[PDB]
Specification:
Chains A, B, C: Pfam families: Fungal_lectin. Three copies of one chain form a homotrimer. Chain A is mainly β. Chain A has one domain: Lipocalin, CATH 2.40.128.190. In chain A, the strands form two sheets. A four-stranded antiparallel β-sheet of chain A has the order 1-2-3-4, with no helix packed on it. A four-stranded antiparallel β-sheet of chain A has the order 5-6-7-8, with no helix packed on it. In chain A, strand 7 and strand 8 form a beta hairpin. The first copy, chain A, is globular. The termini of chain A are far apart. The complex binds the ligand C[C@@H]1O[C@H]2Oc3ccc(CC(=O)NCCCO)cc3S[C@H]2[C@H](O)[C@@H]1O (6 copies).
Chain lengths: 87, 87, 87
């Protein structure tokens, strides 16, 4: 089982991505309880990065299954596929 | 052997967590020598994130042993168990 | 195959490091196309962190081959070795 972690803001918000048995899922903290997020994509390995534009968070999740990495994007309104390609 | 890296400030401070044979340990840089930090917990996989409240650092380490992730918290005065749970 | 991701600035810039078959490479984004960066070092495991000095980026990549981690540094003038040692 393999994790990636990100955080942002003053609360802060935390997102932990877990790769287990070719599935990546998301646990979320926003200052109250941990909860399961919307992110569900295939992968045996994950890494993640985020930034703020004002108060709006932007997340990029790099999901790898075998020899292929797909980027998944949060920009305020659902997970969308990004334009990232490997070597 | 697997690592996680975080940094903060402009010095910078860096922490590198290393999972080796089910033990996670911490190496630290604050502007002079690398040194062994107080973090010592079980795990074969590690991720970490951090934030600053003014000058005070807050670190969260996600230590995974098998199919269980535990969150470890630095808030200025020792490593404490965090409230994180998985799915 | 294993990745590490970092980002900085408002654009933002992103760097994704991929460990594949004991080789770590780098895919870069700066606001248009994804492109291949200069990073090329050995490892089966990678972590990375970055910070700004003003708006100029400093990157540290932790490349692990078997039992030992080597730090690689970007400070604006090519990839250089760092002084990191383990336990
Ligand atoms: C930054 C984001 O924080 C959380 O925000 C939302 C927002 C809408 C939904 C609606 C839905 O899926 N129905 C879910 C989530 S959970 C979680 C996001 O995954 C992501 O981390
Ligand atoms: C920071 C970047 O955000 C996104 O930006 C674009 C822009 C144009 C197209 C076409 C696609 C994307 S997807 C995604 C980029 O890969 C990268 O994450
Ligand atoms: C952000 C932190 O930086 C470093 O700072 C300290 C501070 C005090 C101690 C003594 C102590 O509390 N011992 C506990 C028994 C140890 C460290 S090492 C390292 C921390 O692990 C952590 O990374
Ligand atoms: C940012 C957060 O810091 C910590 O906050 C609390 C707050 C209340 C309880 C009870 C526990 C924790 S532990 C830890 C949270 O999991 C999370 O890291
Ligand atoms: C932050 C960086 O972004 C990218 O920027 C450059 C800049 C220069 C070069 C050429 C070179 O090596 N000359 C520099 C010094 C030679 O003494 C390549 C890259 S690619 C990629 C870097 O790897 C790294 O991510
Ligand atoms: C943030 C840091 O950036 C770099 O900083 C320095 C500074 C001084 C030296 C030479 C020295 O005086 N002692 C190092 C010999 C210890 O055995 C080397 C480095 S490399 C790299 C650091 O590791 C770390 O990333």
């Amino acid at each position: 089982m393999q994790t990636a972690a990100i955080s942002w803001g003053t609360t802060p918000s935390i997102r932990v991505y877990t790769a287990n048995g070719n599935k990546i899922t998301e646990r979320c903290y926003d200052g109250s309880n941990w909860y399961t997020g919307a992110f569900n994509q295939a992968g045996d390995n994950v890494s993640a990065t985020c930034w703020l534009s004002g108060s709006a968070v932007h997340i990029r999740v790099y999901a790898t299954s075998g020899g292929s990495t797909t980027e998944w994007c949060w920009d305020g309104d659902g997970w969308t596929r990004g334009a990232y390609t490997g070597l």
